[PDB]
Design a protein. Structure first.
Lengths: 99, 4
């Protein structure tokens, strides 16, 4: 796990509308294990489902994504989970919507 | 347990 990464700069403000942790994958419509992109805030399924967030990474280059299952943040380039106070707000907003 |  990383306490910081050089890609945290890419994290954009949480949408004013907030987050929807039950939002379907934008490609396959599944609800199983979705992630939200911390740059564009599109929602796509994890790599153990249909890999649409991975596809999104491939298309966009956006580095950091947040899990709607356990609120872990993954950096595709660092290939690691990253935890940092820069992510405090987004994780809280997700948590509040979830519970 | 790989993310993303
Ligand atoms: Ca909302
Ligand atoms: Zn999908
Ligand atoms: Zn994105
Ligand atoms: Zn990184």
């Amino acid at each position: 796990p990383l306490p910081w990464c050089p890609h945290l700069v890419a994290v954009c403000p949480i949408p004013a509308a907030g987050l929807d942790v039950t939002q379907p994958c934008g490609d396959c419509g599944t609800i199983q294990e979705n992630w939200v992109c911390l740059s564009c805030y599109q929602v796509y399924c994890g790599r153990y489902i249909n890999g649409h967030m991975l596809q999104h990474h491939g298309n966009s280059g956006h580095p950091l994504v947040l899990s709607y299952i356990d609120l872990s943040a993954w950096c595709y380039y660092c290939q690691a989970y990253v935890h940092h106070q820069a992510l405090l707000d987004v994780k809280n907003i997700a948590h509040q919507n979830k519970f | 347990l790989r993310g993303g």
